[PDB]
Amino acid sequence: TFGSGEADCGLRPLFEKKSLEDKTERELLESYIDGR
Amino acid sequence: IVEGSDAEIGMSPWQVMLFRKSPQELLCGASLISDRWVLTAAHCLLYPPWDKNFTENDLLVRIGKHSRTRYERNIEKISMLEKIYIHPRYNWRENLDRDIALMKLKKPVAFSDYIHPVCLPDRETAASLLQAGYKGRVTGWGNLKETWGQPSVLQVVNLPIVERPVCKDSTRIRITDNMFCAGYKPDEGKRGDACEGDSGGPFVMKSPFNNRWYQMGIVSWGEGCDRDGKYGFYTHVFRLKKWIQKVIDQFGE
Numbered sequence: 001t002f003g004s005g006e007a008d009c010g011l012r013p014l015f016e017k018k019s020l021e022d023k024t025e026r027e028l029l030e031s032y033i034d035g036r
Numbered sequence: 037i038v039e040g041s042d043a044e045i046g047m048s049p050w051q052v053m054l055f056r057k058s059p060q061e062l063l064c065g066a067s068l069i070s071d072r073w074v075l076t077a078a079h080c081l082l083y084p085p086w087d088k089n090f091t092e093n094d095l096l097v098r099i100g101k102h103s104r105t106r107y108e109r110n111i112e113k114i115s116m117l118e119k120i121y122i123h124p125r126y127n128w129r130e131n132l133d134r135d136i137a138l139m140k141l142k143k144p145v146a147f148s149d150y151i152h153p154v155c156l157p158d159r160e161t162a163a164s165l166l167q168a169g170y171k172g173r174v175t176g177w178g179n180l181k182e183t184w185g186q187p188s189v190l191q192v193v194n195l196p197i198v199e200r201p202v203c204k205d206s207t208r209i210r211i212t213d214n215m216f217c218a219g220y221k222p223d224e225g226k227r228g229d230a231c232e233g234d235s236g237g238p239f240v241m242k243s244p245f246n247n248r249w250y251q252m253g254i255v256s257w258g259e260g261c262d263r264d265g266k267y268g269f270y271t272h273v274f275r276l277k278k279w280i281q282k283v284i285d286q287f288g289e
């Protein structure tokens with residue numbers, strides 16, 4: 001809804017909520033001088 | 037999008053299509069920040085040099101889409117706009133500074149597997165991720181090429197944020213603090229960019245602290261698409277956050 005939006009914001013029903021990863025999200029995390 | 041890929045189903049559930057009533061046409065992208073609010077580029081509604089001035093009545097918003105043109109029966113939600121809000125100091129006159137607008141839906145949308153809001157960054161998230169070299173993701177139904185077209189499905193591309201100085205030196209347009217630029221440098225041998233029809237769409241990042249997706253930018257402008265030595269420019273969302281907060285809190289989410 002704004003600040004870091006809602007409450008459930010940014011958590012995808014078909015990927016994050018299931019603990020599944022999308023084909024290129026790794027490339028992002030690896031750029032943050034390798035995610036989490 | 038130039039040099040991107042087809043999105044996967046439910047990859048960007050916050051992605052919205054800005055759609056013209058008549059002629060029916062894809063105006064721009066947009067992103068859902070709650071069940072009632074959508075965020076876009078102001079130049080998608082107002083651009084006087086091109087005789088562009090859209091009112092609530094002229095448009096509709098489509099959410100949960102994949103296909104550019106099919107009507108996705110039992111998947112997509114279409115809404116009407118209660119109200120449009122353009123940044124009072126949006127500069128259409130010279131450089132698209134504050135190229136941002138909020139749209140209030142006539143009625144709230146129910147979330148689902150294909151529909152779900154993105155987060156707005158807080159000062160620290162912003163501080164940690166908005167760095168040269170860090171990659172974000174852009175999405176949209178815009179031009180495949182600079183000039184020739186339209187993709188059949190939603191396209192996605194991951195691009196790095198570039199150093200403010202390299203941004204400045206690539207164009208003769210006056211860059212402000214409310215903008216950032218993104219793309220691969222020419223040696224880097226790897227391309228991709230947003231393009232015309234892509235405005236209003238989100239530049240998002242995934243936090244490595246809490247795993248959530250945040251919208252850091254809005255697709256704003258560029259010169260041609262995917263040209264070497266050039267880059268895409270985005271409205272810097274954290275910078276315009278107060279305004280954002282402010283309209284939502286008067287006009288009530």
Ligand SMILES: *C[C@@](*)(O)[C@H](CCCNC(N)=[NH2+])NC(=O)[C@@H]1CCCN1C(=O)[C@H](N)Cc1ccccc1
Nearest residue numbers: 131230231232233234235256257258259260261268
């Ligand atoms: C409305 C949007 O679809 C669009 C996005 C273009 C993205 N380009 C790239 N390569 N990432 N923006 C525009 O078309 C804006 C609105 C008005 C003119 N404009 C341009 O991008 C011009 N190409 C350059 C420019 C002109 C005047 C002021 C700012 C930029």
Ligand SMILES: *[C@@H]1O[C@H](CO)[C@@H](O)[C@H](O)[C@H]1NC(C)=O
Nearest residue numbers: 082083084088089090091092
């Ligand atoms: C856009 O149209 C509205 C009426 O719908 C008008 O009030 C506004 O002044 C116009 N904008 C200009 C050309 O900046």
